Design an enzyme around this catalytic site. Structure first.
Site, PDB file in Angstrom:
ATOM      1  N   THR A   1       7.528 -23.996   9.537  1.00 16.21           N
ATOM      2  CA  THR A   1       6.655 -22.970   8.908  1.00 16.21           C
ATOM      3  C   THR A   1       6.707 -21.673   9.706  1.00 16.21           C
ATOM      4  O   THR A   1       6.575 -21.671  10.931  1.00 16.21           O
ATOM      5  CB  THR A   1       5.182 -23.452   8.816  1.00 16.21           C
ATOM      6  OG1 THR A   1       4.399 -22.472   8.118  1.00 16.21           O
ATOM      7  CG2 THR A   1       4.599 -23.690  10.227  1.00 16.21           C
TER       8      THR A   1
ATOM      9  N   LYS B   1       2.973 -20.516   1.033  1.00 18.06           N
ATOM     10  CA  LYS B   1       2.228 -20.304   2.275  1.00 18.06           C
ATOM     11  C   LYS B   1       1.738 -18.873   2.468  1.00 18.06           C
ATOM     12  O   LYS B   1       1.049 -18.569   3.444  1.00 18.06           O
ATOM     13  CB  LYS B   1       3.087 -20.679   3.477  1.00 18.06           C
ATOM     14  CG  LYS B   1       3.612 -22.082   3.471  1.00 18.06           C
ATOM     15  CD  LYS B   1       2.968 -22.898   4.564  1.00 18.06           C
ATOM     16  CE  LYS B   1       3.823 -24.100   4.896  1.00 18.06           C
ATOM     17  NZ  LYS B   1       5.136 -23.667   5.443  1.00 18.06           N
TER      18      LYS B   1
ATOM     19  N   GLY C   1      -1.032 -14.367   5.401  1.00 18.81           N
ATOM     20  CA  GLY C   1      -0.245 -15.581   5.337  1.00 18.81           C
ATOM     21  C   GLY C   1      -1.100 -16.702   5.886  1.00 18.81           C
ATOM     22  O   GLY C   1      -2.277 -16.480   6.166  1.00 18.81           O
TER      23      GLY C   1
ATOM     24  N   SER D   1       5.912 -22.807  13.445  1.00 21.66           N
ATOM     25  CA  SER D   1       6.826 -23.643  14.187  1.00 21.66           C
ATOM     26  C   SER D   1       8.154 -22.926  14.178  1.00 21.66           C
ATOM     27  O   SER D   1       9.170 -23.501  14.531  1.00 21.66           O
ATOM     28  CB  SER D   1       6.957 -25.016  13.523  1.00 21.66           C
ATOM     29  OG  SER D   1       7.314 -24.898  12.154  1.00 21.66           O
TER      30      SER D   1
ATOM     31  N   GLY E   1      14.061 -19.927   9.457  1.00 22.24           N
ATOM     32  CA  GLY E   1      14.331 -21.154   8.756  1.00 22.24           C
ATOM     33  C   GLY E   1      15.632 -21.771   9.211  1.00 22.24           C
ATOM     34  O   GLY E   1      15.762 -22.992   9.218  1.00 22.24           O
TER      35      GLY E   1
ATOM     36  N   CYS F   1      14.712 -23.222  13.088  1.00 16.59           N
ATOM     37  CA  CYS F   1      13.603 -24.171  13.092  1.00 16.59           C
ATOM     38  C   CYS F   1      13.779 -25.290  12.050  1.00 16.59           C
ATOM     39  O   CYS F   1      13.945 -24.996  10.855  1.00 16.59           O
ATOM     40  CB  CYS F   1      12.293 -23.415  12.824  1.00 16.59           C
ATOM     41  SG  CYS F   1      10.837 -24.453  12.679  1.00 16.59           S
TER      42      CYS F   1
ATOM     43  N   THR G   1      11.031 -25.460   9.350  1.00 18.03           N
ATOM     44  CA  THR G   1      10.974 -24.300   8.462  1.00 18.03           C
ATOM     45  C   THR G   1      12.150 -24.272   7.520  1.00 18.03           C
ATOM     46  O   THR G   1      13.274 -24.585   7.931  1.00 18.03           O
ATOM     47  CB  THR G   1      11.036 -23.006   9.247  1.00 18.03           C
ATOM     48  OG1 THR G   1       9.939 -22.952  10.158  1.00 18.03           O
ATOM     49  CG2 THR G   1      10.958 -21.830   8.323  1.00 18.03           C
TER      50      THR G   1
END
Ligand code: DAT
Ligand code: DAT
Lengths: 173, 356, 356, 173
Positions: A1, A33, A45, A124, A156, A159, A162
């Protein structure tokens, strides 16, 4: 995320991922989100529990009615309700709200953090996002939308918590 | 019924309130239907119920002021009630019906003050026939001479029965879905403790049994936290008219300062006259004024048009003390003065929270 | 008629209070406007609402004293109330309207005490006229035939209505801040149970229907943990005047001790007089005293000028017991005496907490 | 993070870093970690959450004027309001206040410790800062502001949880 928000020239935007990861697998990997409030601007957010949120969110869009506009003089008697108060206490949420006056944060303790450049990066994937974002926000042009979305995509990519489904609210002033 | 059509009810209301034409029109209908309805059949007499308005708006705009002057003009009885009182979260008691068991008194102590004139002169041309210390008593001693049984008695509730107005205040906050203030529904009880009033009922009081099946009701509140849809359902139905009043502008305070026919400034004017001084404010004097009020509101706690009041008296303090002196002089208040006694204040975020 | 301009009101007040001129002037304007307004159009006489003052300051400075003496001055009705009572976080009851159902008694029981010398002389030259017991009882009895109906009320109420004065006390205590003593808005309710009074309403009482539409209201409080801006907004509006009184100096104590035309020290004087003793109070005495007060205040809990009282009576303890003896003698209280009964005491601090 | 204060000559100053740290990375690294209850004097600092830390900031603020400048005469009927009282406990901060009388420290629990020489050193790099603080405040004729600023730097320099964005108030007594 990874919730992101860059301010550039006339606007400020917030990007986010849709990956919701329970254990070591990704359920609804397209969670919105990032949401607005649209009563009138103030894009925020959210990072973490999707249940343990909303509350600590729409709670905002109401004082942003009385205190009208004063995001600042909003988090005061608003954000407060999260530590020495009641309602929701002891959870995990990082609502990154953005007015038209400045982008704040809340480590989920009735707190408030003002990013050294109004560049927000929690999740994260928060660091990651930041880094790419920061690197562009100062070595290229590209807008708040662009730089934010190009950075969330880089987040993304590094991670594993993500992904790439995105959601972004923009504006103008 | 004193009469006056919707158009005409807004006219009067504008001599007092500036803007908010929407509400003025609004409470101008609920009022009209009274006049109307009372002209129909014995039938629709007990069938066409009142026409209640729910005012939704920020603080200071004019809700309460509108209904206060709207009453004064209706010459009907009026009473303002803080809905939360009857919430008395202090574990006490308070018959809601007391709301009526007052709007009768107001409309009573009234019938007696609205007759000190109705037969003043006549009763004094009698204080003559009987003469030609204790010369100013026989005036009063005519309080009996002058007929008071029945009429100035039973015809009294017909007032608190014809179309007396009950203006509930902060109906909201008495709702449940608020979170910031979401305790329970004992609160919502207050909502259910009113239904009799606004759904039709009779209450027993001193001068007689009165009936609220025909009282007009005006409730307000900001609805900052809760919505009108969060009020118990009965109420939602016995509240046909919904109107949102608007937030006053800097351009509005300039007006609220001079326009209305009893204006604030116009009050000081007359006031500071008693002391021989003649005052006069400049459009720009009156502008910075406004700008001041607007300033204190933005800067600290936004109270509204109410701020004119303090900012104003605070800037006439000097003059009013001295006033006795200055007689035969004409102090002039322009902007280079308004600022001279306010920029300081208004500038200090904290002092403004004390004396402004 | 009392009356007298703002300048003559500050004068009169100085015969009693020391310093705090800002307050005396400010409370001297609100006042004046009454007499001012009383003389105007039927219109404005029902539009220019009173002019309330909110006093902000530490404990023991004058807030309460100014208005108590500002009453005597106006000769009008006065009444002091602890806003806290009406909060009774216990769960009892305390109809705020009561605040009026007293400032009537105090404004009526007064009339009967304002007239025992309004026709004292008169009724006596008759309490000897019907004899030529003879004055023993027959005076009161005759003081029973002194035309008393109707006139009472009318005036009584119209004495309250005229301009009684209600001094709310420690209002700051009923606002809500954040941490510490931050219970719940139930309190903010007591704020809302007042609006009526401080905004225009009728209350039914024994003697008659009184209307607080024209009552002057003086609220206070130190506002230690809460700004006057944290008061419900409707009150902020009905509170046009704001004065911050200052903390009294040792120099003020020295003054409060001897100056005021009914001083404390000057009371002891006359008091020790009835005992044939004569006291002189050296300047340095009057000073070391002040220092005494100031000291116990800094050292322990800060009460204010109020301190003078204890520490002072604690200095004539000896004198007064003996006093009966000493007749025909003149005791001299100077510095090395004030200190012969103070220093060693004002120094223990703990004892200072019990008897000083 | 390192709050420092070094009463010296006719003055006393409080310095602080501005490094906020999420796990192993640094967000708002320009954190105004030091402010003064502008009530004339009474400078304090903060070591921990940015959120709450504020509460014990205004907390003092009021008790001061009522307990009128009598700082000490505050923590009694003030500071205490943490341990017992019901205001709020189970938090983490150290408002190191200072009138023109003395410099104290509250471990959070309505506590209060006073440096053998009034040299206050808290924060992650809290010790380091003091080691330098003491070392100079003992072999140089340097200033209260200097020895502090010079110390907060050595701290930041050796502690990975303290940086160099400083923030420091002062006065003269
Ligand atoms: N639009 C307007 N025109 C004229 N006077 C106004 C006004 N809005 C407010 N005022 C004045 C009259 C009232 O005595 C005072 C407070 O207004 P109010 O009607 O009691 O407030 P509200 O009904 O918003 O609670 O301010
Ligand atoms: N400035 C002043 N001059 C003279 N007497 C004063 C004074 N301030 C206070 N006093 C006296 C009169 C009172 O009996 C007593 C306490 O003062 P007060 O007015 O009753 O308290 P406060 O107004 O602070 O609530 O001290």
């Amino acid at each position: 995320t990874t919730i992101v928000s860059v301010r550039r020239n006339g606007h400020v935007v917030i990007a986010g991922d849709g990956q919701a990861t329970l254990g070591n697998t990704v359920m609804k990997g397209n969670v919105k989100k990032v949401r607005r409030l649209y009563n009138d601007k103030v894009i925020a957010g959210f990072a973490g529990g999707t249940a343990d949120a909303f509350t600590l969110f729409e709670l905002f869009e109401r004082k942003l009615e009385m205190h009208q506009g004063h995001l600042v003089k909003a988090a005061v008697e608003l954000a407060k309700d999260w530590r020495t108060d009641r309602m929701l206490r002891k959870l995990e949420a990082l609502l990154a709200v953005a007015d038209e006056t400045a982008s704040l944060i809340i480590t989920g303790n009735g707190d408030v953090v003002q990013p050294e450049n109004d560049l927000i990066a929690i999740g994260s994937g928060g660091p990651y996002a930041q880094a790419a974002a920061r690197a562009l926000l100062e070595n290229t042009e590209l807008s708040a939308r662009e730089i934010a979305e190009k950075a969330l995509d880089i987040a993304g990519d590094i991670c594993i918590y993500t992904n790439h489904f995105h959601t972004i609210e923009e504006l103008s002033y | 019924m004193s009469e006056m059509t919707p158009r005409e009810i807004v006219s009067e209301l504008d001599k007092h309130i500036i803007g908010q034409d929407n509400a003025k029109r609004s409470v101008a209908i609920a009022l009209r239907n009274r006049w109307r309805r009372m002209q129909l059949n014995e039938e629709l007499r007990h069938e066409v119920t009142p026409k209640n308005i729910l005012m939704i708006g920020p603080t200071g705009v004019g809700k309460t002021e509108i209904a206060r002057r709207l009453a004064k003009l209706a010459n009907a009885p009026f009473i303002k009630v803080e809905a939360t009182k009857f919430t008395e979260v202090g574990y006490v008691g308070k018959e809601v019906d007391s709301i009526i068991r007052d709007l009768t008194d107001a409309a009573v102590k009234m019938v007696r003050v609205q007759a000190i004139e109705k037969n003043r002169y006549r009763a004094e041309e009698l204080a003559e026939e009987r003469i030609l210390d204790a010369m100013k008593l026989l005036i009063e001693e005519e309080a009996a001479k002058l007929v008071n049984p029945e009429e100035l008695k039973q015809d009294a509730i017909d007032a608190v029965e014809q179309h007396g107005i009950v203006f509930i205040d902060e109906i909201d906050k008495i709702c449940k879905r608020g979170e910031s203030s979401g305790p329970d529904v004992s609160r919502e009880g207050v909502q259910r403790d009113l239904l009799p009033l606004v759904e039709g009922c009779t209450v027993s009081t001193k001068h007689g049994m009165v009936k609220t099946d025909h009282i007009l009701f005006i409730a307000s509140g900001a609805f900052q936290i809760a919505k009108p849809s969060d009020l118990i359902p009965e109420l939602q139905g016995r509240l046909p008219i919904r109107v949102e009043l608007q937030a006053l502008t800097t351009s509005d305070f300039e007006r609220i300062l001079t326009e209305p026919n009893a204006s604030i400034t116009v009050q000081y004017k007359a006031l500071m006259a008693t002391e021989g001084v003649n005052i006069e404010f400049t459009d720009s004097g009156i502008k910075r004024i406004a700008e001041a009020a607007w300033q204190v509101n933005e800067s600290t706690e936004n109270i509204g048009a109410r701020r004119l009041h303090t900012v104003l008296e605070r800037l006439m303090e000097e003059i009013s003390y001295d006033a006795s002196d200055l007689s035969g002089q004409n102090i002039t208040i322009d902007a280079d003065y308004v600022s001279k006694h306010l920029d300081a204040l208004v500038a200090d975020e904290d002092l403004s929270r004390f004396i402004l």
